[PDB]
Structure 1
């Protein structure tokens, strides 16, 4: 089965991901059919995360029956190319979060 999955790039303790179209039997960072985009799991200066996708190629691979992995299902819902995964209906776990403000430039308590 063709799979839309995540290949690990970056370095140790600095993860970066590429979105790949692969045969399922292939090694994780080895052989692939196509690079489809990227995803940055670390939050940047803008307060959010980054992602790029080749929308037409992802539509091609989904049209011929490729199966997205568990993080790629979330990433493709978030970009609007797939419906929401079934577990996002459960809502978030609550609890008292520490909302004491920290300075953006210095990281100390305001």
Structure 2
């Protein structure tokens, strides 16, 4: 099963995630198939969240379950919002 999900970058007490698609069986910070956004949980920047949403829809379309928190953030930038 392939996943949209969060990879930890940044540093210590400086979490920074990259919203990535990957094979579920890979380690967390290992090789991903595609970057599709990033996220700063401390919102220390005006732009602490961003998502290429045409691409998110793509993968969802070919079956890729997001983590639960991957999907929260996906929502905030309305990946799932219609009409």
Flag as ranges the 4+ runs of structure 1 deviating above 3 A: none
Tell me the CA shift for residue 45 of structure 1: 6.1
Q: Flag the structure with higher strand content.
A: 2
Partner residue in 2 for 1:36: 36
Partner of 2:49: 51
> How far is the alpha carbon of 1:21 from its aligned partner?
0.3
- Contact (CA 8 Å) 1:73, 1:82: kept in 2 or not? no
Q: Distance in 2 between matches of 1:20 and 1:59?
A: 13
Check 1:45–1:67 CA distance in 2 against 1; reply closer, same or farther (3 A cut).
closer
TM normalised by structure 2 equals 0.88
Shift of 1:81: 0.9
Determine the C-alpha separation between the residues in 2 that align with 1:45 and 1:53.
Answer: 15
TM-score (norm 1): 0.68
Q: Deviations over 1:26-84 (max 9, x none)?
A: 010011110111011113265xx61111111111001111101011111111111136x
Query: Over alpha carbons, which structure has the higher Rg?
Result: 1
1:74 aligns with 2:72: yes
Count of aligned pairs between the two proteins: 81
Q: Which residue of 2 aligns with 1:99?
A: none
SS in 2 for 1:42: coil
Tell whether 2:35 aligns with 1:24.
Answer: no
Task: For CA contacts below 8 A with separation 6 or more, give which structure has more relative contact order.
Answer: 2
